[PDB]
Amino acid sequence: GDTIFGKIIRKEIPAKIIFEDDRCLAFHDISPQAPTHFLVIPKKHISQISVAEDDDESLLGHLMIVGKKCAADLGLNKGYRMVVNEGSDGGQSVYHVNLHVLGGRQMHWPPG
Protein backbone atom coordinates (compact mmCIF):
# COMPACT_ATOMS: atom_id res chain seq x y z
CA GLY A 1 0.00 0.00 0.00
CA ASP A 2 1.25 3.43 -1.05
CA THR A 3 1.79 6.10 1.61
CA ILE A 4 2.27 9.84 1.74
CA PHE A 5 6.03 9.19 1.81
CA GLY A 6 5.70 7.49 -1.58
CA LYS A 7 4.02 10.64 -2.86
CA ILE A 8 6.89 12.73 -1.50
CA ILE A 9 9.50 10.49 -3.18
CA ARG A 10 7.57 10.73 -6.46
CA LYS A 11 7.43 14.56 -6.08
CA GLU A 12 3.63 14.47 -6.29
CA ILE A 13 3.31 16.64 -3.17
CA PRO A 14 5.84 19.18 -1.85
CA ALA A 15 8.28 18.68 0.98
CA LYS A 16 11.28 20.67 2.21
CA ILE A 17 13.97 18.34 0.87
CA ILE A 18 17.37 18.41 2.58
CA PHE A 19 19.19 15.69 0.63
CA GLU A 20 18.46 13.09 -2.00
CA ASP A 21 20.38 10.29 -3.65
CA ASP A 22 19.44 7.25 -5.74
CA ARG A 23 18.25 5.27 -2.71
CA CYS A 24 17.00 7.65 -0.01
CA LEU A 25 15.51 11.06 0.66
CA ALA A 26 15.83 13.40 3.66
CA PHE A 27 13.23 16.09 4.33
CA HIS A 28 11.96 18.24 7.17
CA ASP A 29 9.08 16.75 9.13
CA ILE A 30 5.77 18.52 8.57
CA SER A 31 4.94 18.21 12.32
CA PRO A 32 8.30 19.10 13.90
CA GLN A 33 8.91 18.09 17.52
CA ALA A 34 12.19 20.00 17.91
CA PRO A 35 13.75 23.11 16.34
CA THR A 36 15.30 20.72 13.82
CA HIS A 37 13.31 17.58 13.03
CA PHE A 38 13.78 15.77 9.73
CA LEU A 39 13.21 12.30 8.32
CA VAL A 40 15.46 10.04 6.25
CA ILE A 41 13.55 7.43 4.25
CA PRO A 42 14.59 4.73 1.76
CA LYS A 43 13.15 4.91 -1.72
CA LYS A 44 12.49 1.18 -1.47
CA HIS A 45 9.12 0.71 0.21
CA ILE A 46 9.92 -1.21 3.38
CA SER A 47 6.74 -0.84 5.42
CA GLN A 48 8.35 -1.16 8.87
CA ILE A 49 11.65 -2.17 10.40
CA SER A 50 10.19 -5.48 11.63
CA VAL A 51 9.95 -6.71 8.01
CA ALA A 52 13.36 -5.48 6.84
CA GLU A 53 15.51 -8.21 5.30
CA ASP A 54 19.16 -9.03 5.95
CA ASP A 55 19.98 -7.73 2.46
CA ASP A 56 18.66 -4.32 3.62
CA GLU A 57 21.41 -3.87 6.23
CA SER A 58 23.55 -1.53 4.12
CA LEU A 59 20.51 0.53 3.12
CA LEU A 60 19.39 0.94 6.73
CA GLY A 61 22.90 1.95 7.75
CA HIS A 62 22.94 4.39 4.82
CA LEU A 63 19.90 6.12 6.32
CA MET A 64 21.84 6.66 9.55
CA ILE A 65 24.96 7.94 7.77
CA VAL A 66 22.84 10.32 5.67
CA GLY A 67 21.07 11.36 8.87
CA LYS A 68 24.26 12.19 10.71
CA LYS A 69 25.69 14.06 7.71
CA CYS A 70 22.47 16.07 7.34
CA ALA A 71 22.53 16.81 11.08
CA ALA A 72 26.03 18.26 10.78
CA ASP A 73 25.03 20.26 7.68
CA LEU A 74 22.06 21.67 9.62
CA GLY A 75 24.34 22.79 12.45
CA LEU A 76 23.40 20.26 15.15
CA ASN A 77 26.81 20.52 16.80
CA LYS A 78 25.43 20.04 20.33
CA GLY A 79 23.90 16.65 19.51
CA TYR A 80 20.65 15.09 18.41
CA ARG A 81 18.49 11.97 18.69
CA MET A 82 17.69 9.39 16.03
CA VAL A 83 14.44 7.43 16.26
CA VAL A 84 12.79 4.58 14.35
CA ASN A 85 9.24 3.69 15.39
CA GLU A 86 7.75 0.23 14.88
CA GLY A 87 4.06 -0.53 15.04
CA SER A 88 1.36 0.61 17.43
CA ASP A 89 3.40 0.59 20.64
CA GLY A 90 6.25 2.32 18.84
CA GLY A 91 3.95 5.09 17.69
CA GLN A 92 4.75 4.55 14.02
CA SER A 93 2.75 7.14 12.08
CA VAL A 94 3.51 6.09 8.46
CA TYR A 95 4.05 2.51 7.28
CA HIS A 96 7.18 3.36 5.31
CA VAL A 97 10.45 3.00 7.24
CA ASN A 98 11.62 6.41 8.35
CA LEU A 99 14.47 7.59 10.54
CA HIS A 100 13.69 10.68 12.63
CA VAL A 101 16.52 13.07 13.49
CA LEU A 102 15.69 15.64 16.19
CA GLY A 103 17.88 18.36 17.64
CA GLY A 104 18.25 22.01 18.47
CA ARG A 105 17.00 21.52 22.02
CA GLN A 106 17.76 19.21 24.91
CA MET A 107 16.18 15.84 24.21
CA HIS A 108 14.80 14.23 27.35
CA TRP A 109 14.78 10.74 28.84
CA PRO A 110 12.75 8.53 28.58
CA PRO A 111 12.37 8.99 24.79
CA GLY A 112 8.59 8.93 24.99
Chain contacts with a copy of itself (rule: CB under 8 A): 33-34, 49-50, 52, 54, 56-62, 64-65, 67-68, 71-72, 76, 78-92, 100, 102-112
Q: Which stretch of DSSP H or E encloses residue 18?
A: strand 17-20
Query: Which residues in 13-72 contact ligand 9ZA (CB under 6 A)?
Result: 15, 29-31, 39
Please tell me whether residue 65 adopts helix, strand or coil conformation.
Answer: helix
Q: How many CA atoms lie within 13 A of 6 on its CB side?
A: 9
Q: Which is nearer to ligand 9ZA, 8 or 55 (CB)?
A: 8
Q: Which residues pair with 39 in a beta bridge?
A: 27, 100
Q: What is the CA 112 to chain-centroid distance, rounded?
A: 17
Q: What angle do CA 112, 36, 110 make, to 5 degrees?
A: 15
Segment near ligand 9ZA (CB under 6 A), from 17-25, 52-60, 64-72, 84-92?
Answer: 84-92
Q: Which is nearer to a copy of itself, 12 or 108 (CB)?
A: 108
Q: Interface residues with ligand 9ZA (CB under 6 A)?
A: 4, 15, 29-31, 39, 85, 91-94, 98, 109
